[PDB]
Amino acid sequence: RALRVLVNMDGVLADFEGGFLRKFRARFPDQPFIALEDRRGFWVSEQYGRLRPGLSEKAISIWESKNFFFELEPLPGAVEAVKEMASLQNTDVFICTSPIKMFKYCPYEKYAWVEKYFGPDFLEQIVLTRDKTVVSADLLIDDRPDITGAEPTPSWEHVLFTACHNQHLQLQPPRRRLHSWADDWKAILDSKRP
Amino acid sequence: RALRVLVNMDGVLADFEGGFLRKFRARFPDQPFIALEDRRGFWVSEQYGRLRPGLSEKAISIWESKNFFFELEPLPGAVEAVKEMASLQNTDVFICTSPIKMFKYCPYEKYAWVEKYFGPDFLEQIVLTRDKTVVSADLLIDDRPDITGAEPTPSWEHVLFTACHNQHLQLQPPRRRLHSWADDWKAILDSKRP
Numbered sequence: 001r002a003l004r005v006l007v008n009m010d011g012v013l014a015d016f017e018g019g020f021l022r023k024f025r026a027r028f029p030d031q032p033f034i035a036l037e038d039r040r041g042f043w044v045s046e047q048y049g050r051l052r053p054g055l056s057e058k059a060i061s062i063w064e065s066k067n068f069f070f071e072l073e074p075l076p077g078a079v080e081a082v083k084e085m086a087s088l089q090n091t092d093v094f095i096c097t098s099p100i101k102m103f104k105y106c107p108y109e110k111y112a113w114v115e116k117y118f119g120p121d122f123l124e125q126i127v128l129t130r131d132k133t134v135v136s137a138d139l140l141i142d143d144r145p146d147i148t149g150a151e152p153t154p155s156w157e158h159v160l161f162t163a164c165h166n167q168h169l170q171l172q173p174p175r176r177r178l179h180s181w182a183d184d185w186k187a188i189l190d191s192k193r194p
Numbered sequence: 195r196a197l198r199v200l201v202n203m204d205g206v207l208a209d210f211e212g213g214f215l216r217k218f219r220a221r222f223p224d225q226p227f228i229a230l231e232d233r234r235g236f237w238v239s240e241q242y243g244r245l246r247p248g249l250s251e252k253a254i255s256i257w258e259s260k261n262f263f264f265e266l267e268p269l270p271g272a273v274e275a276v277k278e279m280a281s282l283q284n285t286d287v288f289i290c291t292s293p294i295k296m297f298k299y300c301p302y303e304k305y306a307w308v309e310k311y312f313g314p315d316f317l318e319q320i321v322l323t324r325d326k327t328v329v330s331a332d333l334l335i336d337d338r339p340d341i342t343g344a345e346p347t348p349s350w351e352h353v354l355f356t357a358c359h360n361q362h363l364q365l366q367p368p369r370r371r372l373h374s375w376a377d378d379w380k381a382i383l384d385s386k387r388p
């Protein structure tokens with residue numbers, strides 16, 4: 001009866017792309033980089049790997065470093081929108097996020113980041129998983145174009161959240177975008193209500 | 195098409211009850227304790243809180259301590275069963291576990307414990323969530339009798355995994371138990387296959 005919305009973290013709430021680029025440039029000032037306007041494809045590591053030898057591994061070392069996830073800046077409007085969204089009648093919001101393979105810091109920092117921006121009580125709303133298809137909900141707002149896993153027919157509608165890496169993608173027509181948190185996310189939610 | 199089984203961690207794969215009791219007794223040798231045979235009700239903290247003043251807080255300090263989750267011993271047969279279960283044709287296994295409120299160590303140690311007993315590749319199968327009702331699957335094997343949350347009608351059948359705290363409970367008849375990993379879990383899975 002309540003509408004359930006899964007909201008992705010990196011690329012939707014947290015600015016992974018901008019934080020990575022800043023830290024990559026600071027740590028490797030003599031390496032080439034990829035300006036955000038030039039990002040293409042979900043995987044940062046793959047494009048850097050295509051840019052020059054051994055750059056995939058250097059990219060990876062940025063997000064494997066302590067404080068990388070914790071120090072990500074929220075995206076504009078994200079904290080305000082999700083707070084408003086959660087307070088809406090008949091609306092349950094979960095933050096659904098995938099950790100990286102190296103688990104020393106990432107899960108911890110993601111919990112810490114949510115506490116910081118949404119408060120202790122919002123920690124109950126976090127779902128950490130590598131497979132989003134096994135989480136059920138009416139909506140998934142997520143910047144990754146290809147969301148697959150163990151469940152061939154997920155219950156959610158995936159709404160693509162715009163990011164530098166996906167902004168040029170033509171979606172297969174039924175599919176829909178949320179262009180930024182300034183875009184009309186209430187209209188999207190309302191279209192799913194009974 | 196593949197059968198999906200969610201397997202809980204504490205009380206099913208990891209011996210939370212025995213590890214807690216050992217560490218509680220070692221740290222508080224002059225406090226009264228609850229023998230496992232005498233455990234009743236899911237919440238360890240509540241029963242200890244009923245046993246004497248300020249014992250809830252002392253109990254909590256055990257599982258909030260570093261290395262508590264990491265150093266839990268697997269339950270008998272658990273690692274062998276889950277490994278066999280995951281290798282079965284048309285069967286996907288996820289470990290579905292709730293972290294405690296204090297997130298400094300618990301998420302990290304749970305990932306570490308899974309790596310230790312199941313290997314790096316099994317980390318992809320972990321779902322960390324306070325709400326299991328929003329994870330979809332055919333079966334949930336879990337020692338907690340009362341599993342509720344945002345989804346009023348979860349897709350899984352909850353099979354109650356026997357533990358000291360629940361062994362005496364009469365379930366509402368449709369509900370079913372897995373008595374230990376030596377019990378016939380394949381028969382339970384097979385009853386759910388198309």
Ligand SMILES: O=c1[nH]c(=O)n([C@H]2C[C@H](O)[C@@H](COP(=O)(O)O)O2)cc1/C=C/Br
Pocket residue numbers: 008009010011016042043044045046060096097098099100106144
């Ligand atoms: O290029 C990457 N970009 C990225 O976000 N990640 C990681 C970063 C994050 O933990 C998880 C976020 O995915 P979503 O929850 O937003 O879908 O995947 C990993 C790589 C490459 C690893 Br090799």
Ligand SMILES: O=c1[nH]c(=O)n([C@H]2C[C@H](O)[C@@H](COP(=O)(O)O)O2)cc1/C=C/Br
Pocket residue numbers: 202203204205210236237238239240254290291292293294300338
């Ligand atoms: O008494 C408790 N027992 C317990 O397992 N936990 C915590 C321990 C574990 O992180 C999570 C396990 O639940 P399941 O995933 O097995 O369902 O709840 C907390 C308390 C009290 C907190 Br106050």
Ligand SMILES: [Mg+2]
Pocket residue numbers: 008009010011012142143144
């Ligand atoms: Mg993302």
Ligand SMILES: [Mg+2]
Pocket residue numbers: 085086087088089090091092
């Ligand atoms: Mg609400």
Ligand SMILES: [Mg+2]
Pocket residue numbers: 202203204205206336337338
């Ligand atoms: Mg349990």
Ligand SMILES: [Mg+2]
Pocket residue numbers: 279280281282283284285286
């Ligand atoms: Mg299998």
